[PDB]
């Protein structure tokens with residue numbers, strides 16, 4: 157029936173996006189209940205970003221300096237406070253479109269949808285993963301900050317990312333909704349370089365199962381391997397080490413397809429050592445690593461939401 | 463700032479999705495104003511699908527046989543009629559969430575977002591193109607039929623696709639919202655094979671411009687070409703022939719980057735003749751053809767919507 161990189165439907169998050177302007181800076185915020193969440197660097201000028209002292213910059217700001225606009229209607233700020241790298245703007249009206257939601261801090265390897273916004277207005281939606289180096293490979297231009305990453309389970313929106321910074325190398329860094337950066341990144345314009353971008357081995361294996369379920373099977377071979385043996389090969393190619401937990405997580409895909417996890421590892425090994433010789437898998441000429449096992453089961457089984 | 467395959471935000475379409483059940487068949491419909499649109503094969507059994515006579519099958523159906531459910535609320539069918547391959551179910555309540563919208567029949571090469579649904583509930587969202595052979599490469603399982611494809615311009619939803627059929631080869635066929643199939647496909651379980659899947663040359667060039675704007679430039683060379691010369695090469699590799707209209711459409715990307723369209727064609731030629739030698743472009747090991755020139759400008763410039 158086919159396999160595609162798909163995002164969660166975005167409507168529940170669309171209804172939470174607002175525009176935050178402090179002085180000459182405009183970016184996005186997230187309106188849940190009577191609180192608007194946005195990056196604290198909204199209070200900075202472009203100059204401030206080299207060496208900002210956020211507590212000091214904050215002292216000069218009052219409730220009325222934060223202009224918050226929900227589509228065409230202005231929201232009244234009745235309180236503000238800084239939590240880590242985010243600002244929480246208390247407004248006098250609960251967002252009537254607040255969905256059921258949680259704040260979750262995800263682990264590397266975990267996937268989520270991003271609703272890219274500009275001036276509190278939604279631009280587009282795409283799927284991302286937290287890379288093992290704690291960056292993400294997004295699509296963000298100036299004014300996109302405060303765009304959020306999320307997952308949905310039936311009717312609950314688990315928000316996991318807010319966008320803050322682009323590194324000189326074109327990749328993206330940001331926070332959870334408590335304002336704590338993923339990785340060692342900070343909201344300052346300095347020399348911060350990303351570490352090694354390793355491949356999320358468990359996600360590649362999940363995606364190979366997805367290929368098999370959809371008819372792409374040329375890469376299945378007559379071999380098997382061990383975790384230890386496979387991991388010697390993974391390390392050489394900058395792949396996350398595979399653990400027994402990962403094997404356990406792939407158990408459902410294993411069961412449905414009748415290909416043992418270690419046999420699929422031997423398929424992956426051979427693809428790493430020999431390449432794809434110009435062939436493709438689910439329409440890709442390289443090995444996709446931004447589907448989780450849970451992603452594969454969900455799109456392959458057709459789970460939906462409130 | 464990065465470049466990603468992104469769909470339009472899906473909320474406006476989410477609010478139009480309903481479930482249609484006729485007998486033992488459940489699939490999705492689209493509720494706009496006081497009309498629900500759905501595939502006419504909702505009236506078929508699995509057996510009927512080999513050789514259905516839709517007019518005859520329809521005679522046994524009445525308004526009350528169409529069960530239409532909008533989330534948890536039932537809609538009253540007060541009229542029904544068949545238009546080409548779709549059924550229009552007149553209900554007694556206008557959808558309060560009807561967005562501004564149009565019905566457009568797109569051309570091959572044109573891109574759109576699909577909101578995959580199951581039982582009137584949204585599952586996920588992804589970007590697609592009408593292939594030159596009038597198929598699309600989607601992600602659709604049983605019960606997905608009646609899922610729609612759309613574009614948004616600011617506040618207007620232009621619906622262009624409704625999903626009807628999977629061909630034996632794993633690709634997808636469907637109609638415009640007047641119920642007319644794209645291509646020579648029909649809503650009957652028969653031997654219908656897709657034609658040659660040619661690459662959408664104009665979209666590849668657009669995406670190479672996108673790469674250059676984002677820092678990927680290793681494939682720019684010291685050469686140029688002519689339309690005629692380039693097209694000899696395109697034909698050999700099953701690429702759509704490039705026309706002066708295409709060149710004109712790429713004019714804005716040409717202008718912004720200062721790479722002439724024909725110079726970019728010579729880059730493409732070299733990539734076709736020599737391959738990518740294991741390198742990548744915007745994170746792909748093959749040449750993406752499901753971004754339009756207009757797509758590139760939009761994500762690269764940050765256009766948003768009501």
Ligand SMILES: C[C@H]([C@@H](O)c1ccc(O)cc1)N1CCC(Cc2ccccc2)CC1
Nearest residue numbers: 369408409410412452453454456457458604
């Ligand atoms: C593979 C999936 C899904 O259930 C699943 C995915 C991943 C898992 O880890 C577990 C389950 N099922 C869905 C039902 C399909 C029935 C079918 C057969 C032939 C033609 C048309 C339809 C057979 C495959």
Ligand SMILES: C[C@H]([C@@H](O)c1ccc(O)cc1)N1CCC(Cc2ccccc2)CC1
Nearest residue numbers: 298675714715716718758759760762763764
């Ligand atoms: C390329 C895009 C966009 O406008 C566009 C895209 C495709 C077109 O066909 C036409 C225009 N612009 C956006 C503004 C950017 C300003 C900038 C420069 C340096 C650092 C940060 C920001 C420079 C590039």
